[PDB]
Amino acid sequence: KTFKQRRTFEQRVEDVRLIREQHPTKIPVIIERYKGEKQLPVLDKTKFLVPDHVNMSELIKIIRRRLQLNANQAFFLLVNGHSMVSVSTPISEVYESEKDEDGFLYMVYASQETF
Ligand SMILES: Cc1nn(C)c(C)c1NC(=O)CC#N
Ligand SMILES: [Cl-]
């Protein structure tokens, strides 16, 4: 069901190695809906190549645009299981401290802060 369940550790590592080779300036991001989530839709895909210069504030804007949300729908983004201390950090920095061992950066979204 989840990305980690669909692909072996070996497979996730090799995909990150190919994104490095073919899209060297991009951060490999996995973005999943919270399994509890009732309100927001599911994304059209799971794996995203994010330009390494955008900060987390701009990534939230990007995902809200991809979900085609309106001004008063709530959106919370967990990175590596937890709240972001700051949305102003460049995703290149966030990646280096919050990447998984497989080399993806995992994110989950919900309409409640209580996931
Ligand atoms: C071929 C290889 N063997 N081992 C053991 C490692 C770390 C590698 N590196 C990559 O391929 C990284 C990338 N991209
Ligand atoms: Cl690139």
Q: Which pair of structure tokens corresponds to residue 112?
A: 């409640």
13 CA to middle of ligand 1, Å?
9
Residue listed under structure tokens 């669909």: 6
To what resolution in angstroms was this structure determined?
A: 1.9
Q: Which pair of structure tokens corresponds to residue 17?
A: 């190695």
Q: Which one-letter DSSP state was computed for residue 36? A: T
The residue ranges of every structural domain in the chain are 1-115
- Is the CB of residue 17 below 6 angstroms from any atom belonging to ligand 1? yes
- DSSP H/E element including 16: helix 9-22
CA 107 – CA 82 distance, rounded (Å): 9
The strand pairing partners of 47, in sequence order, are 30
Counts of helices then strands in the chain (DSSP H, E): 4, 4
* Ligand in nearest proximity to the CA of 22: 2
Method of structure determination: X-ray
Q: Please, are residues 110 and 35 in contact by the beta-carbon 8 Å criterion?
A: no
Q: Which pair of structure tokens corresponds to residue 30?
A: 């996995």
